[PDB]
Paper text:
HsTMEM120A forms a symmetrical homodimer with each monomer containing an amino-terminal coiled-coil motif followed by a transmembrane domain with six membrane-spanning helices. Each monomer contains an N-terminal soluble domain (NTD) on the cytosolic side and a transmembrane domain (TMD) embedded in a lipid bilayer.
Unexpectedly, the HsTMEM120A protein reconstituted in nanodiscs contains a [name] molecule per monomer that is from an endogenous cellular source and copurified along with the protein. The [name] molecule assumes a bent conformation and forms numerous specific interactions with amino acid residues on the lumen surface of the cavity. Mutation of the Trp193 to Ala dramatically reduced the affinity between [name] and the protein. In the presence of [name], the intracellular cavity of HsTMEM120A is not only constricted by the four residues at the extracellular side but also blocked by the bulky adenosine 3-phosphate 5-pyrophosphate group of [name] as well as its cysteamine and pantothenate groups.
Author numbering:
A (entry chain A), B (entry chain B): 7 to 336
The structure:
């Protein structure tokens, strides 16, 4: 007769029930005032930012009319308002923030994980591991689809995987932007163009003109995944190094050693990126030249030759901008 | 010389700066203990649920050995443990919850909007309006692609829109599940199958056998969007009615009038759904019959004929289940 155990467990879980429901009640109260605090802080910050920017506008428009001797105080005045802006960014980094017009077309609730600092730093790492693992899958299946097979089922499967990976990746990093980062919005239009390119390659009716481009496209995709493979290593190394510099617990790792390490890494890495840039430019060129041949007539060739050229222009300019800015930073 | 205004605005915004940073500090503190409370509550609830289910298991296995006269107390004992489970569901409805293995493959942070009740009820409405608006776009462009055009560019564009809409929609409702709902997981595998179907239709190389199926597929897509058009009306009406019943402020709207209205609406709606079910079954049949013709040889025909049949079986069974359960509920 084990019922006795069950019944006295019933009432002891019952006493637990009330002592836990009291906690639940006070929790609800706490949540209420915390919400009020959040609303108050956000409204106040918005008002202050507006006031600051407008007064800075007024001072800037009045500045040329004024001589430099009294303008001394003025230049350190903007030199301090900019850091006031920086601290405003710091403070806004926690308060829940509105969605940025692309998430709001897929979602509509609020996801600002960075209510802590560990809770954010341990999201970017997960993102990096996602990029690496998917690159493994793509390089493997690209090898299979280029050296040993010639069908169109497998080719369509590879292109579908590509067009899914790019879209989930643009969602992750469009969250990672409003949490906080400097992600240089070209790096997202890059995904949109690459998605359009794969999509067009998906409805290419074969014949005697597909087989002339399949080889180059597959090989280039292989190489690009390899570059992502190396870039993982450098990026993750940089992230851990920078945390270990910000966290002084391990040892007083000076900024000098970090900078030397990062500079050596980047300067070693850069030739491969430039090789890839020129590889796709040559790719676009051969595609146009092929299109000029009067033997083909398919609208897919020019529409698959423009994204390559656009994509090269953007990538080349942005890489040079980053290296040049880093060089002046020194 | 407007500098004076600017400088005294500087120091008055400065006094504002400290009086706001104090608020920020206390806000951070509050957030800290609120996090501790959340963790404590979730751990406690997990332990209690495990204990309750295991003791219920023990009682159930011991029950057949025991006679009914003493089992009286036993049946109201399970009749009360089930409501204890219900209240546990209520309480867990607020605490942040882990992601369900599909979001965690696209995301990895936590989005439980239902920290309130308005903040959730005003998400489902947005979801409904999204479904309606996208149905408008699809019905319009389907009309254009069937009566007046015959190309393949426009057809591919329509199929791409379909395969994007289904995927964003499965993301929205897979959030809406873990917030809280009874969404009958067949209704999501439905989206996966429909996505696979459109994908296969996307790489169909035309010829003398595509033109025999294009008409039926487009017309069926039109009709299906029309059913979504009506289902919006009924669903939104039901949601507002149920809120107006739960909210007794307007008037003591009895459950009887609500039930009569909902029953009339559903009984009026059902014939169209059944028509659609049989429409797609006939569609799968004609597709197989066409495949039997020795004049075609394309692997796309059987792979486009199975999802139709599978999809019909699932839809028919699930609709009958819902109507039967609702009938016993009365
Ligand atoms: C830019 C590059 C030198 C990296 O340098 P970097 O670490 O970004 O240097 P910065 O200090 O400017 O970093 C700026 C921000 O860009 C972010 N970033 C996000 N996505 C990125 C991406 N795809 N590439 C580069 N930077 C990226 C970094 O995270 C960093 O922000 P955070 O560190 O604060 O989170 C290198 O990644 C690059 O050139 N990108 C190549 C892109 C590519 O795939 N090309 C392939 C051609 S075949
Ligand atoms: C099922 C149906 C009668 C709706 O009834 P219902 O309101 O779901 O009745 P229930 O009380 O069982 O509702 C159960 C839950 O299912 C949810 N639900 C979510 N997505 C749904 C969907 N696509 N269809 C039906 N119910 C859905 C409802 O929101 C409800 O949960 P909630 O009200 O607590 O949020 C009706 O929508 C249906 O038969 N679906 C047809 C699906 C379809 O598109 N078929 C096309 C064939 S051509």
């Amino acid at each position: 007769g084990p019922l006795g155990d069950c019944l006295r467990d019933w009432e002891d879980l019952q006493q637990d029930f009330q002592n836990i429901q009291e906690t639940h009640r006070l929790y609800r109260l706490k949540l209420e005032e915390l919400t009020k605090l959040q609303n108050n802080c956000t409204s106040s910050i918005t008002r202050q930012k507006k006031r600051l920017q407008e007064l800075a506008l007024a001072l800037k428009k009045c500045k040329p009319s004024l001589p430099a001797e009294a303008e001394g105080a003025a230049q350190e005045l903007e030199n301090q308002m900019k850091e006031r802006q920086g601290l405003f960014f710091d403070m806004e980094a926690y308060l829940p923030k509105k969605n940025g017009l692309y998430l709001s077309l897929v979602l509509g609730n609020v996801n600002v994980t960075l209510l802590s600092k560990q809770a954010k730093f341990a999201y970017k790492d997960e993102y990096e591991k996602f990029k690496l693992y998917l690159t493994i899958i793509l390089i493997l299946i690209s090898f299979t689809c280029r050296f040993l097979l010639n069908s169109r089922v497998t080719d369509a499967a590879f292109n579908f995987l590509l067009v899914w990976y790019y879209c989930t990746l643009t969602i992750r990093e469009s969250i990672l932007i409003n949490n906080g980062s400097r992600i240089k919005g070209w790096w997202v239009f890059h995904h949109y163009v690459s998605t359009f390119l794969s999509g067009v390659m998906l409805t290419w009716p074969d014949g005697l003109m597909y087989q002339k481009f399949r080889n180059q496209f597959l090989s280039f995709s292989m190489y690009q995944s390899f570059v992502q493979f190396l870039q993982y290593y450098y990026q993750s190394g940089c992230l851990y190094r920078l945390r270990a510099l910000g966290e002084r617990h391990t040892m007083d790792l000076t900024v000098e050693g970090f900078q030397s390490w990062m500079w050596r890494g980047l300067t070693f890495l850069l030739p491969f990126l430039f090789f890839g840039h020129f590889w796709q430019l040559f790719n676009a060129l051969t595609l146009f030249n092929l299109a000029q041949d009067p033997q083909c007539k398919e609208w897919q060739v020019l529409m698959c030759g423009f994204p390559f050229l656009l994509l090269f222009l953007g990538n080349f300019f942005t890489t040079l901008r980053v290296v040049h800015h880093k060089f002046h930073s020194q």
